[PDB]
A paper describes a structure:
Here we used genetic code expansion to express and purify multi-milligram quantities of Ub bearing homogeneous phosphorylation at Ser20 (Ub [pSer20]), Ser57 (Ub [pSer57]), and Ser65 (Ub [pSer65]) from E. coli and to solve the structure of Ub (pSer20). Phosphoserine was directed into the protein using an evolved SepRS/tRNACUA pair, an approach that we previously demonstrated allows the production of homogeneous and site-specifically phosphorylated Ub and other phosphoproteins (Rogerson et al., 2015). We obtained crystals for Ub (pSer20), which diffracted to 1.55 Å and showed clear density for the phosphate group. This underscores the quantity and purity of proteins obtained using the evolved SepRS/tRNACUA pair (Rogerson et al., 2015). Serine 20 phosphorylation has been detected repeatedly in human, mouse, and rat (Choudhary et al., 2009, Lundby et al., 2012, Manes et al., 2011). We conclude that phosphorylation at Ser20, Ser57, or Ser65 does not affect the first two steps of the ubiquitination cascade with the E2s tested. We conclude that Ser20 phosphorylation on Ub changes UBE3C from a dual-specificity ligase that makes K48- and K29-linked chains with unmodified Ub to a ligase that makes predominantly Ser20 phosphorylated K48-linked chains with Ser20 phosphorylated Ub. Our results suggest that the phosphorylation of Ser20 in Ub may shut down the formation of K29-linked Ub chains formed by UBE3C, and this may enable the proteasome to resume proteolysis and aid cellular recovery following proteolytic stress. Ser20 phosphorylation increased OTUD3-mediated cleavage of K11-linked Ub, but it decreased OTUD3-mediated cleavage of K48 linkage. Ser20 phosphorylation increased USP8-mediated cleavage of K6-linked Ub, but it decreased the USP8-mediated cleavage of K11 and K48 linkages.
Residue numbers in the entry: 1 to 76
Write the structure that this text describes.
């Protein structure tokens, strides 16, 4: 399925994902498109930070959902 991610430039990118994909894998697919290393990524959906180790299905992220990417560091 397709989901959307709003990135640090404000652009909305598309990702090709499956419900059993881990958040770490979603971060790796963001790196593949946008170059941002996964340890610097924090993904937000419906007001929750998405934990590494959990899956898209754990957060009920269904097709055509939009996630928000923010920087995880302290500075920025």
């Amino acid at each position: 399925m397709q989901i959307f991610v709003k990135t640090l430039t404000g652009k909305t990118i598309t990702l090709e994902v499956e419900p059993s994909d881990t958040i770490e894998n979603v971060k790796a697919k963001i790196q593949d498109k946008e170059g941002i290393p996964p340890d610097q990524q924090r993904l937000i959906f419906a007001g929750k930070q998405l934990e590494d180790g959990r899956t898209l299905s754990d957060y009920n992220i269904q097709k055509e959902s939009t996630l928000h990417l923010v920087l995880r560091l302290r500075g920025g």
